[PDB]
């Protein structure tokens, strides 16, 4: 290895994950839209939103998958998509010492199915996704805010929510309690335009319009 700076590529795991992705796509054609393996050997399964419970249950229970652990459940906001919200399931298989990522999509008004019946861990993750992104989860045992203040309006992790929000809190001596007011900043956050006008990575170049 005369390349001490470049991260070493492991092709055996890449092939193993490719074969398992083919396996998963073949077993569930009804829900699998796309499967891919990263250059750093991470396997993703893109599914229709209807297949959340079937795909997750298959990956948990199939003797060749045994993904018993829900490592993380989060959402990603991409405003330029009509289905702006990208729901990400990160699963771990202790039996095969492997990890898998399952992603689907939704918009502001379509409910995602709650996966608490598949993983008990999903209870707080789905509450957090609802809190920070506004994604509703149907059949959730207890869906409500988890991270934000009581009565907080909006979903802060949306890309169009301002960084400092809309209200501040302070103690008011007239009314003898903490009150909420529209946010004023003695020093407003200074927006930095950092992106270089030159293309960094040719291998990721999108074809011209």
């Amino acid at each position: 290895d005369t390349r001490p700076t470049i991260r070493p590529r492991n092709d055996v795991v890449h092939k193993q994950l490719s074969a398992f992705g083919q396996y998963v796509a073949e077993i569930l054609p009804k829900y699998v839209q796309q499967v891919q393996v990263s250059c750093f050997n991470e396997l993703e399964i893109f599914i229709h939103p209807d297949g959340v419970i079937p795909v997750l249950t298959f990956l948990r229970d199939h003797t060749n998958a045994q993904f018993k652990s829900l490592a993380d459940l989060t959402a990603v906001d991409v405003p330029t998509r009509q289905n702006r919200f990208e729901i990400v399931y990160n699963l771990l298989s202790l039996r095969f010492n492997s990890r898998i990522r399952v992603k689907t999509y939704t918009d502001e008004l379509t409910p995602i199915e709650s996966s608490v019946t598949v993983y008990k861990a999903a209870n707080w993750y789905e509450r957090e996704i609802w809190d920070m992104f506004g994604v509703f989860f149907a059949n959730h045992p207890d869906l409500r805010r988890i991270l934000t203040d009581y009565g907080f309006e909006g979903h802060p992790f949306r890309k169009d929510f301002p960084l400092s929000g809309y209200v501040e809190l302070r103690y008011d001596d007239e009314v003898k309690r903490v009150v909420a007011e529209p946010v004023e900043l003695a020093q407003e956050f200074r927006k930095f335009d950092l992106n270089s006008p030159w293309e960094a990575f040719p291998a990721y170049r999108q074809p011209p319009e």
């Binding site: 501040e168 302070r170 103690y171 008011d172 001596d173 007239e174 003898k176 007011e181 529209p182 004023e184 900043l185 003695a186």
Partner: protein, 342 residues
């Protein structure tokens, strides 16, 4: 306007209101509310204090960083007044005391200190002075308090002819010494009242109304040289008012007719206390007196404010005086007291 005095922002804590106010008497009941209202809109507030600086700490969160400045001052020293007044464009006089001390009588705090503040403010060139006298101020009053208030009104208008005199009635609020004063009579058995209080009529005003009226008088260009009466919306016989106070506090109400002379003896006995007398002869005289009617004076409604009734804000004052039995009762379980009108 000086370029640093141009209003900016949206009227919030980080805004600039263009107001630089020295609030004499800012560490008191009325003072904490006008200071809060000034710091709400982003005003520069200068706080002269003679108390221990620990006693000014409740005013620190009232304004943005740098917008509340605390400075020592001496009421008997014109240099301190000049120091705390040099850079302000409005001066608010709120200093007063319901009792005389060994160093400050009623003439000192109601005549000499206001005249000194007015004269120093005129010399330093502050555009606006707001002076707080009493509604009942009278040169022939039975009260030294009100006689000195009248003398001080004269002196302030003489020294600062453009000053806005504001004359509130008995102000009520969370730390008012008016509703709490009557609610504190449960500690001495019943409620003694001269002539049972059936000859005294009061027109109390709410503290937030007074503070918003002071702010509006600051912002109103047509308040220079004007005198305002800040009265409440309703007038009450003192018996009816105290009965309503005790009903709201839920304490048993058993008044009795203590005569005037015995009540003055009682007040004289309380003056011996060297810490905040519970009552005095002067307070006994001013409680038994009726509020005057001054229809010729502009009021809180000539500054754009609707006067708040007592039957709306009395529970926020008297819920502290209720026992555990009646601590969690609604404000409407007590019907409003009978109002005497003009």
């Amino acid at each position: 306007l000086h370029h640093a005095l141009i209003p900016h922002g949206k009227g919030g804590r980080s805004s600039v209101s263009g107001i630089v106010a020295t609030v004499f008497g800012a560490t008191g009941f009325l003072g904490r509310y006008v200071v809060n209202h000034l710091g709400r809109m982003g005003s520069q507030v200068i706080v002269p204090y003679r108390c221990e600086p620990y006693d000014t700490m409740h005013l620190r969160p009232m304004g943005d960083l740098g917008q509340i400045i605390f400075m020592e001052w001496n009421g008997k020293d014109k240099d301190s007044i000049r120091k705390v007044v040099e850079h302000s464009n409005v001066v608010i006089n709120l200093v007063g005391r319901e009792w005389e001390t060994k160093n400050f009588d009623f003439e000192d705090v109601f005549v000499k200190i206001p005249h000194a503040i007015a004269q120093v403010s005129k010399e330093a060139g502050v555009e606006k002075l707001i002076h707080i006298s009493h509604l009942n101020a009278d040169i022939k009053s039975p009260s030294r308090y009100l006689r000195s208030k009248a003398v001080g009104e004269k002196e302030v208008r003489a020294a600062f002819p453009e000053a806005t005199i504001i004359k509130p009635s008995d102000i009520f609020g969370r730390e008012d010494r008016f509703l709490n004063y009557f609610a504190s009579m449960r500690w001495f058995g019943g409620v003694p009242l001269i002539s049972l209080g059936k000859e005294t009529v009061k027109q109390p005003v709410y503290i937030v109304d007074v503070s918003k009226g002071i702010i509006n008088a600051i912002k109103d260009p047509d308040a220079k040289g004007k005198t305002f009466a800040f009265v409440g919306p309703n007038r009450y016989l003192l018996f009816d008012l105290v009965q309503y106070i005790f009903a709201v506090a839920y304490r048993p109400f058993l008044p009795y007719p203590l005569p005037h002379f015995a009540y003055r003896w009682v007040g004289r006995l309380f003056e011996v206390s060297p810490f905040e007398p519970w009552t005095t002869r002067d307070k006994v005289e001013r409680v038994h007196m009726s509020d005057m009617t001054l229809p010729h004076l502009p009021g809180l409604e000539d500054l754009g404010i609707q006067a708040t009734p007592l039957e709306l804000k009395a529970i926020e004052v008297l819920r502290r005086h209720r026992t555990y039995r009646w601590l969690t009762s609604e404000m409407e379980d007590v019907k409003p007291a009978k109002t005497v009108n003009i």
